[PDB]
RNA sequence: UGGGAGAGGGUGGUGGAAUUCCCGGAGUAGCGGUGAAAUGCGCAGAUACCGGGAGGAACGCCGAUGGCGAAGGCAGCCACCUGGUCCACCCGUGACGCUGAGGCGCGAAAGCGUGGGGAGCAAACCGGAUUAGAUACCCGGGUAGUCCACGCCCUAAACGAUGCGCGCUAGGUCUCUGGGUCUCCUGGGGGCCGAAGCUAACGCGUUAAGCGCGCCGCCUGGGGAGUACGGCCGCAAGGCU
């Protein structure tokens, strides 16, 4: 907005692992405000991921996000008769916002049939380093570096 | 093969050239914007000079170059950043000098400089 | 850091006083104005012509490279 | 009489930086150009570098709210020829003065003629782009012309849109150049704000657009039109009235 710096909504940490991060993800899961539904497919996916990976999946998705955290994206700046994909040091709040938006985005991409299935499977790969979830980031951070000629136009 | 030499930075609105010469002045290698793969105003960018200046230095030392005196001419936005990577390249950058040419009110320029 | 103070008596017309005259030419060989030389109007003018003549004899430069 | 400053004007010499091309060395895949691109130039070796040579034009910093000039206008350095102008001393002539229809001379740029010159730039012109179109604005080339000599041409936002000379009418701050006694005082120019006063207002105000005297030019609604006719000038384009 035009006034001052907007505020950051601090969420109510989840009721299972005691984390606000978890509380954040279910939201993206949560469609039509169906928290119970969303809260399920998550802790459900948290089950399949456990069975196929016997390490506390809390850490799993604690990892698979940093792997998703993009460090540099591009943003279009149209100085004069042209718009420049001026890349900028992505912001923290946004990075979580960015990582929190393709896993599901890439999970919903996934072909397997059940919700908790997909959501989980995207959780693992990023913990390893595989999947379109890492794709966006990967593609994003290098187009920027593929445009490192505009950093002086930064902001 | 030569260890000490020179480096000239022709810095212009539309581009930036980096040519490296022997102590006598005989060029030994050169490079500029497009050589790294840019076409157009994107050439008129510092980061171009970087790769440009860099790619020229990299190729230079491959012939044994390790020291070069610097020479800059022009008023280009890609000028200084070129002087940068050269120092942050791998050469001793023994000196810097601006021999940018300027008349004393001689020939008339084009219409767009009046 | 005005210069006129840096010196005392001295001929504005000694068009051969290189060591002195060359004192008013910035390290880029250019002539230096008055907010930098402390010279006055009539003074200032009487200089250059002095410098110039030498700059023609081969004493002072018309310009100089720059070092950083 | 004695001085002073100054791109005042004219002739002849002359000094360095840069652009363009030629020659030589080295060197490689692009240079150039734009808001972005393209024409264009480049493996027949360009761009950026070094070295040498030829030619033309304009004189960077100094330089500036500066200076000189009646005006247009004048800017590297040198010398010669020459003009106007200012200050002081208050030496000489003793009203010899101001203005000035006519006349005459000067007159930036473009343009004309003749003979040179021709690097950069650059009307017309060709090309490439933007556009619905683009006979244009931007880009790549490019002819006259811009430069010199001698002739014309005589117009303009030739402006301070303010004719010239003189006398009278608070000052303040800045700057150029003089004289003094050197704090400062006085002459002459260049700007600024402002006394009173003027002015339709904006504004001017010891550089008047203020109070006055003299003389010249000039205006009398707009357009038609600075056109037609005649006359003069001119090689012509066109000028004057
Ligand atoms: Mg370019
Ligand atoms: Mg030509
Ligand atoms: Mg050659
Ligand atoms: Mg050369
Ligand atoms: Mg100037
Ligand atoms: Mg003036
Ligand atoms: Mg007497
Ligand atoms: Mg008598
Ligand atoms: Mg008269
Ligand atoms: Mg004339
Ligand atoms: Mg002319
Ligand atoms: Mg003719
Ligand atoms: Mg003829
Ligand atoms: Mg001719
Ligand atoms: Mg020609
Ligand atoms: Mg043109
Ligand atoms: Mg048509
Ligand atoms: Mg067309
Ligand atoms: Mg055309
Ligand atoms: Mg041209
Ligand atoms: Mg002709
Ligand atoms: Mg003609
Ligand atoms: Mg002509
Ligand atoms: Mg002619
Ligand atoms: Mg007349
Ligand atoms: Mg004027
Ligand atoms: Mg006047
Ligand atoms: Mg008039
Ligand atoms: Mg009157
Ligand atoms: Mg004095
Ligand atoms: Mg005065
Ligand atoms: Mg006033
Ligand atoms: Mg009043
Ligand atoms: Mg009246
Ligand atoms: Mg006056
Ligand atoms: Mg008159
Ligand atoms: Mg009528
Ligand atoms: Mg009428
Ligand atoms: Mg007329
Ligand atoms: Mg007639
Ligand atoms: Mg007529």
Notes on the structure:
With 155 residues, chain A is mostly helical. Chain A has helices at 20-29, 35-52, 57-66, 92-99, 103-109, 115-128, 132-145; strands at 72-74, 87-89. Chain A is built from 7 helices and 2 strands. In chain A, strands 1-2 form a two-stranded antiparallel sheet. Chain B has 114 residues and is of the alpha+beta class. In chain B, 22% of the residues lie in helices and 28% in strands. In chain B, helix 1 (46-61) runs parallel beside helix 2 (79-87). Chain B is globular. In chain C, 31% of the residues lie in helices and 3% in strands. The longest helix of chain C has 17 residues, at 41-57. The chains are: A mainly alpha (155), B alpha+beta (114), C mainly alpha (68). Chain A binds chain B through residues 148-152, and chain B through 38, 42, 45-48. One magnesium ion is lined by residues 14-15, 43-44 of chain B. The structure holds one RNA strand of 241 nucleotides. Chain C: Located on the back of the platform of the 30S subunit where it stabilizes the close packing of several RNA helices of the 16S rRNA. Forms part of the Shine-Dalgarno cleft in the 70S ribosome, where it probably interacts with the Shine-Dalgarno helix. Chain C: It comes from Thermus thermophilus (strain ATCC 27634 / DSM 579 / HB8).
Write the layout of secondary structure elements.
The structure is cut from a larger assembly and holds chains A (155 residues), B (114 residues) and C (68 residues).
Chain A: H1 20-29, H2 35-52, H3 57-66, E1 72-74, E2 87-89, H4 92-99, H5 103-109, H6 115-128, H7 132-145
Helix pairs in contact in A: 1-2, 2-6, 3-6, 5-6
Chain B: E1 4-12, E2 15-21, E3 27-32, H1 46-61, E4 67-74, H2 79-87, E5 97-98
Parallel strand pairs in B: 1-4
Antiparallel strand pairs in B: 1-2, 2-3
Helix pairs in contact in B: 1-2
Chain C: H1 18-21, H2 41-57, E1 66-67
Bound molecules: magnesium ion (MG) (41 copies).
Residues 14-15, 43-44 of chain B line the site of one magnesium ion.
Chain B binds one RNA strand of 241 nucleotides through residues 6, 8-10, 12-15, 17-22, 24-35, 40-41, 71, 73, 101-112.
């Amino acid at each position: 907005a035009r006034r001052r710096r907007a505020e950051v909504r601090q969420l109510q940490p989840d009721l299972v692992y005691g984390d606000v991060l978890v509380t954040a993800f279910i939201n993206k899961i949560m469609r039509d405000g169906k928290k119970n539904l969303a809260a399920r497919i998550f802790y459900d996916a948290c089950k399949i991921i456990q069975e196929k990976t016997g390490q506390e999946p809390l850490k799993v998705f604690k990892q698979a996000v940093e792997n998703v955290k993009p460090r540099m994206e591009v943003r279009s700046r149209r100085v004069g008769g042209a718009n420049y994909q001026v890349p900028m040091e992505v912001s923290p709040r946004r990075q979580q916002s960015l990582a929190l938006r393709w896993l599901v985005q890439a999970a919903n991409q996934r072909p397997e049939r059940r919700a908790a299935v997909r959501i989980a499977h995207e959780l693992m790969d990023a913990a390893e380093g595989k999947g379109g979830a890492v794709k966006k980031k990967e593609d994003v951070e290098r187009m920027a570096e593929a445009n490192r000629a505009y950093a002086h136009y930064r902001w | 093969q030569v260890a000490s030499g020179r480096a000239y930075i022709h810095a212009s609105y539309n581009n930036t050239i980096v040519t490296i010469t022997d102590p006598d002045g005989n060029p030994i290698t050169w490079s500029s914007g497009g050589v790294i793969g840019y076409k157009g105003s994107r050439k008129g960018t510092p980061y171009a000079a970087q790769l440009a200046a860099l790619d020229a230095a990299k190729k230079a030392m491959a012939y044994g170059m390790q020291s070069v005196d610097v020479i800059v001419r022009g008023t280009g936005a890609g000028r200084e950043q070129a002087i940068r990577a050269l120092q942050a390249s791998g050469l001793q950058v023994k000196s810097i000098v601006d021999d940018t040419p300027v008349p004393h009110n001689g020939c008339r320029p084009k219409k767009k400089f009046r | 850091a005005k210069v006129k103070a840096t010196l005392g008596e001295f001929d504005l017309r000694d068009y051969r006083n290189v060591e002195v005259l060359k004192r008013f030419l910035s390290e880029t060989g250019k002539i230096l104005p008055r907010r930098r030389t402390g010279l006055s109007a009539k003074e200032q003018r009487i200089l250059a012509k002095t410098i110039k003549r030498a700059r023609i004899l081969g004493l002072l430069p018309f310009t100089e490279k720059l070092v950083r």
